[PDB]
Amino acid sequence: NQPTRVILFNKPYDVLPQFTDEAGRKTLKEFIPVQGVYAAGRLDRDSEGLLVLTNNGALQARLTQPGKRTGKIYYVQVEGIPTQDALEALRNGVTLNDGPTLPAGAELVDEPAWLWPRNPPIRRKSIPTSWLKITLYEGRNRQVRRMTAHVGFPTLRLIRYAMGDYSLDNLANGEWREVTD
């Protein structure tokens, strides 16, 4: 039948997680000259980082089926310096307009050594920023951005480092690699 194709991509900012043309927007066609693969877990246009692309239904389901509790690790740049109480809330649960969140990982971290510049750069001189490592097991709309804002520390930049088995290890922004066996 259809030979399996699995590709990992480090998605740039302002690129859609798709191959289909979308008027006025940049897509994966500019980066990955492969047809027939699509996202196993879409990553927002204004997010960056790990995108898994495949043609295989089993893998798609494994990674995306609602309720599968697929783990995702994000590095998030936020305004201010989150308090211990705020981080505890992120770990335990907050209630968004669509309901409570599941328990999560949330830790204050150093700016990652592997970070690349964003073009354009983030959104101020007199206000510090911080980095969080957030580990989620759900995939609701703009979830990390909504959670951080909820507890008082809006997101400026969002990078998905890992999803399921996969990570960005050794993948520059805009680069892809094939996963084979």
Side-chain angles (χ1 to χ4, degrees), residues 64-91:
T64 68
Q65 192 103 4
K68 280 261 187 292
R69 308 283 186 255
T70 304
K72 294 170 295 181
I73 300 177
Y74 297 87
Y75 285 81
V76 193
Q77 192 175 199
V78 304
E79 293 193 330
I81 309 172
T83 65
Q84 295 181 281
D85 166 68
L87 294 170
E88 286 174 2
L90 295 174
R91 292 175 200 126

Side-chain angles (χ1 to χ4, degrees), residues 13 46-48 75-80 111-112 115-124 126-132 145 153-159:
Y13 183 78
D46 59 347
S47 296
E48 296 164 84
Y75 285 81
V76 193
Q77 192 175 199
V78 304
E79 293 193 330
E111 183 163 87
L115 190 65
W116 53 90
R118 206 172 81 174
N119 67 322
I122 65 161
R123 287 36 173 166
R124 248 194 254 284
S126 64
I127 308 173
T129 69
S130 298
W131 287 88
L132 307 179
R145 291 181 174 269
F153 301 90
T155 290
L156 299 169
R157 188 174 183 190
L158 185 56
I159 302 170

Side-chain angles (χ1 to χ4, degrees), residues 50-69:
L50 185 63
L51 189 61
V52 183
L53 302 165
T54 189
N55 62 354
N56 184 92
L59 180 55
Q60 288 283 160
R62 190 190 308 151
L63 283 172
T64 68
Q65 192 103 4
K68 280 261 187 292
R69 308 283 186 255

